[PDB]
RNA sequence: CGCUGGGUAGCCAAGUGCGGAGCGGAUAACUGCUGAAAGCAUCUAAGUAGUAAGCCCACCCCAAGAUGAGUGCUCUCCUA
RNA sequence: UUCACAUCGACGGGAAGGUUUGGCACCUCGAUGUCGGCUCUUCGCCACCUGGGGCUGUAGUAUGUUCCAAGGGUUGGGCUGUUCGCCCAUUAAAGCGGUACGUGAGCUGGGUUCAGAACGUCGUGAGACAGUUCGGUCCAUAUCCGGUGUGGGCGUUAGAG
RNA sequence: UCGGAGAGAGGCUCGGUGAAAUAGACAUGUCUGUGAAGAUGCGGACUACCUGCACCUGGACAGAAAGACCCUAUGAAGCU
RNA sequence: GGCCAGUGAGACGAUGGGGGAUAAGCUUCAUCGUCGAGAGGGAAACAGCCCGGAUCACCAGCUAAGGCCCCUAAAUGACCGCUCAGUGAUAAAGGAGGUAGGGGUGCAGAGACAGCCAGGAGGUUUGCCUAGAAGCAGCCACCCUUGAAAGAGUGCGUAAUAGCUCACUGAUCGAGCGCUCUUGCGCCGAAGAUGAACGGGGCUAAGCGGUCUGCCGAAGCUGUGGGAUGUAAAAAAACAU
RNA sequence: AACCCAGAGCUAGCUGGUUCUCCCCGAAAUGCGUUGAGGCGCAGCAGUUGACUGGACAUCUAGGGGUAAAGCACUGUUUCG
């Protein structure tokens, strides 16, 4: 997955969600999930 | 002028927070890569008393004496000890945040 | 990178201990009544 | 350590070849056998906290041994023995002491066998000796040929640092040669050979059980 | 070594053998299972499973001056 | 091809790092010896190869970009006093840097910073040029720390193997 | 490349004779900080029985020559 | 005014500006403080920061700045809240259903919020672009009919068909739900070279904020007892130093 | 631009050094000028002595400015309609 530091949403499938102390993209499309840091 | 202490149930010590898994006991020998980091839970497989031990050694004087003091402390894994026949006592504890 | 590091005597004026407490420096010394007038330390006696 | 078996002693002779049948060359390595292989002390979790078995070799006379030895091996009624060993195992349930060890029922043939004996002991020897350091330039006007050069960067750190590869006495020291095969049996000389080279010169004495692999025989950790 | 031709042991490599193993443990990145806050969803702020030449042990050598100086077997301590 | 974010990303903005050229001139002028190379190390990761993953405008092979990861490895030659860099043949790849641009009481002295001489140029001239050229003395028995090895003494609660 | 072996003189041991540069006193560890910005000597932590011998020189901004480069002096000298 | 000295290299900090890059432990002036010439206590060590200006003695006491888990002197004190990051030592833009609140705003017993089921048309197919498109390469436009609800139709996909699916409404189900700002403490962004390096040991209060009351704490002050200087010209006593 | 001796203890606004005790007071690193800039002279600040003075600290009041701030009425600059 792509990182950078300003993570938001891309389309309206993509959802934020925390996961072990990191804000994390979760979509069907494979291409925008992502990871802060 | 003080006195002895015994520990028993080394292994059954209580530790706050995620330090179970983030505080890094460690040591070196000399060389530029003797570094040896090791957790909490490792040492408590290894060698469960070096964390008594390492923890006491901080408190007490550094110098001479408390080189000397620190053969007064005996630490224990198991629930038993060989120190019967000076018999202790139970030891007071005037704090009531070590009981979780 | 353009950011200094503070290093000389400002090292002090950053880091000296401060208290920063209405309630801590309001404080001031305990009172006490003042003790009933006490007799003299020594008196000769005629010798 | 634990050993995957129990071995035994035995004394390196000296070298040879060994023609196989279809005219294979194999540089073979002899080792003898003197009378003694007995086991003189079985020890256990109980008494000692690990399992073990003492093994002697070497019989000489009996005016030559210290007399607390002789205590030691006078207690199993065990001869006179010069050498003592022993082989820590996972289980000793099959061992007790005044009994005989013969090699050629624990290693029948083409076993992988572990070696283990004093090297030659070469002295106080150099660095491209000891450490194979590369030399210096023998013209162009240098002056340093088989010298070590630099033995640190300069004020930082500002000391050497600890284990730098340095002289000092090379080889007379313990080693151990891993998974040698047997070549052939012979009973009736009590001799055994084995391929490959053997540490130390012919009279020394060493120690050869069976090899020890990590995941096969000895308790993983 | 007057200069050369060969050379045992010894030393030596260009020569001769061996070596680097593990379905062992715990993790990182990542993929997950089950599933709340939030009737949905979610790899998790309960729990848990896979998995790196890395980390720890295992392999080889040293090692109780480890002053925390250990353990076990054996031996000795005569005469007046 | 349409689709900002597979891969590039103008215009501008916000940072860390202390290896570049510099600014300041705080330590050293009764001395802190230089460029490169040889030998010998040892750390850092912002990862050239090797291990394990994600995305792909990833069919496959082979890439591309990026994450974890510094355990190990990172050739021999031609030209140059060199660093840098180009080239030949290979290689899994032929990584970037710190340690007084690591290391001269360890080495070399080809280069730069002495005295000789010469060309060009400037100067009436003596002479001069971060312009070139030929030549040109690198001392040292380790006191201490530190380091590689090897002994003795004493201790380890009677003394020993 | 890629070192290896051997001889001789030293080195090493014993006996005899017996210097030198140097030297504030020295009971003289490492790390990371601190500080006239680069510490055995201050702070904290770690390591470390005492004392010799033979070997190697990273540091003691080691020794050696009141810097020979640069600058200053209403200094000196040679030359034009 | 007489006799007669040294000084004329300044330093950091505060403020006011200049030069520089609104960089420098940079440089140059102005007004102050300290060091210089200043010990002591706090700041882990540390001339310039904070308290305070050492005549001397006492194994007497009260305090300042600052602190009270242990090393290491003093409450492992009390009460109301926050943080779970070892944040507590170290830097920003930016990012966020983190956490504890606060202030607006909208929705709901004539059923909200999510979940499951049903429908999700026709015409003026507007015109334009195109060989071709009923909405979906695309431009302009976005009026009307039927209805509980349907748009010149959100997204997927097709060259274009077709198709999937959304807004919206109907029922089911019964107490809460959504949108947008905002404060405090924290998370990511936050990578370096010999080795924890952020006093240590360690702590979920032994951290942060507010509030109350005790205590420790200097060569300061008080108390007791001496010396010296000046007033001062003998002593003494006194005041100040 | 030899060596020895003498002038010569040449000169050195530059380094280095300069020896017992107690008591009291106690600086300056600023300005002007300088063939001067790490030197010197004068002023400023010390000590000592003498003469003449009554202020210093604090409080209030008065007096003239043209800085901060503020502003566009002048001088310049500038956006839109
Ligand atoms: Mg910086
Ligand atoms: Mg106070
Ligand atoms: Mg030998
Ligand atoms: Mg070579
Ligand atoms: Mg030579
Ligand atoms: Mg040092
Ligand atoms: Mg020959
Ligand atoms: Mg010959
Ligand atoms: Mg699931
Ligand atoms: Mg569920
Ligand atoms: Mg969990
Ligand atoms: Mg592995
Ligand atoms: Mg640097
Ligand atoms: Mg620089
Ligand atoms: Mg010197
Ligand atoms: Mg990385
Ligand atoms: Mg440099
Ligand atoms: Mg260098
Ligand atoms: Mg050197
Ligand atoms: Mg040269
Ligand atoms: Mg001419
Ligand atoms: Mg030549
Ligand atoms: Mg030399
Ligand atoms: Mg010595
Ligand atoms: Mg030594
Ligand atoms: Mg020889
Ligand atoms: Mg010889
Ligand atoms: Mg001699
Ligand atoms: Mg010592
Ligand atoms: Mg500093
Ligand atoms: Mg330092
Ligand atoms: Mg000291
Ligand atoms: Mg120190
Ligand atoms: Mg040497
Ligand atoms: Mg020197
Ligand atoms: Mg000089
Ligand atoms: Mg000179
Ligand atoms: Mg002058
Ligand atoms: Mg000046
Ligand atoms: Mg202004
Ligand atoms: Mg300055
Ligand atoms: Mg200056
Ligand atoms: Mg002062
Ligand atoms: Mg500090
Ligand atoms: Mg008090
Ligand atoms: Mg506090
Ligand atoms: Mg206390
Ligand atoms: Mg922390
Ligand atoms: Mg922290
Ligand atoms: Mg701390
Ligand atoms: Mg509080
Ligand atoms: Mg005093
Ligand atoms: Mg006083
Ligand atoms: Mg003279
Ligand atoms: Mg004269
Ligand atoms: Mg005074
Ligand atoms: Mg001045
Ligand atoms: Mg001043
Ligand atoms: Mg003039
Ligand atoms: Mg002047
Ligand atoms: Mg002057
Ligand atoms: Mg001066
Ligand atoms: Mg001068
Ligand atoms: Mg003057
Ligand atoms: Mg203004
Ligand atoms: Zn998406």
Same mark, same amino acid.
């Given at each position: ?37 | ?24 006991? =460690?040591?070196?020998?000399? =060389? ?34 408390? =080189? ?25 504890? =005037? ?6 | ?47 | ?31 003898? &056998?003197? #009378? ?8 256990? #979790? ?12 070497? *019989? /000489?006379?009996? *005016?030559? /041994? ?8 006078? %207690? ?10 022993? &082989? *820590? ?12 060890? /013969?090699? #050629?029922?624990? &290693?029948? #043939? ?22 194979? &350091?590369? *030399? ?42 891993? %998974?040698?095969?047997?070549? %052939? ?20 004495? /060493? ?8 995941? %096969? ?5």
């Amino acid at each position: 997955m792509k990182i950078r530091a300003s993570v938001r949403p891309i389309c309206e499938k993509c959802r934020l969600i925390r996961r072990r102390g990191r804000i994390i993209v979760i979509c069907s499309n494979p291409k925008h999930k992502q990871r802060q840091g | 002028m003080g006195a002895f202490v015994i520990v028993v149930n080394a292994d059954k010590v209580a530790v706050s927070g995620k330090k179970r898994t983030q505080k890094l006991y =460690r040591r070196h020998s000399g =060389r530029p890569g003797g570094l040896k980091e090791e957790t909490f839970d490792q040492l408590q497989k290894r060698i469960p008393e070096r964390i008594i031990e390492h923890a006491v050694r901080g408190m007490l004087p550094k110098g001479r004496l408390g =080189r000397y003091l620190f053969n007064h402390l005996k630490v224990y894994k198991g629930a038993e000890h060989p120190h019967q026949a000076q018999q202790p006592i139970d030891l007071p504890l =005037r704090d009531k945040r070590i009981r979780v | 990178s353009s950011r200094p590091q503070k290093k000389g005597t400002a090292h002090h004026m950053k880091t000296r201990p401060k208290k920063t407490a209405r309630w801590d420096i309001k404080r001031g010394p305990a009172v006490y009544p003042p003790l009933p007038p006490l007799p003299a330390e020594w008196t000769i006696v005629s010798s | 350590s634990v050993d995957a078996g129990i071995g035994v002693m035995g004394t390196k002779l000296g070298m040879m070849s060994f023609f196989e049948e279809d005219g294979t060359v194999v540089p073979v390595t002899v080792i003898g &056998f003197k #009378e003694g292989n007995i086991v003189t002390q079985v020890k256990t #979790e109980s008494t000692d906290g690990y399992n073990a078995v003492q093994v002697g070799y070497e *019989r /000489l006379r009996d *005016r030559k /041994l210290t007399m607390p030895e002789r205590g030691h091996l006078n %207690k199993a009624g065990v001869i006179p023995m010069r050498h003592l060993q022993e &082989f *820590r195992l996972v289980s000793v349930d099959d061992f007790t002491p005044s009994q005989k060890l /013969l090699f #050629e029922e624990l &290693f029948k #043939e083409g076993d992988m066998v572990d070696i283990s004996g004093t090297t030659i002991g070469k002295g106080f020897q150099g660095g491209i000796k000891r450490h194979n &350091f590369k *030399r210096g330039l023998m013209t162009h006007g240098s002056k340093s040929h088989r010298a070590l050069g630099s033995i640190g960067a300069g004020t930082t750190p500002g000391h050497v640092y600890k284990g730098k590869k340095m002289p000092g006495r090379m080889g007379g020291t313990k080693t151990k040669i891993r %998974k040698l095969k047997i070549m %052939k049996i012979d009973t009736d000389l009590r001799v055994v050979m084995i391929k490959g080279a053997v540490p130390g010169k012919p009279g020394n004495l /060493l120690r050869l059980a069976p090899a020890k692999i990590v995941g %096969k025989n000895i308790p993983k950790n």
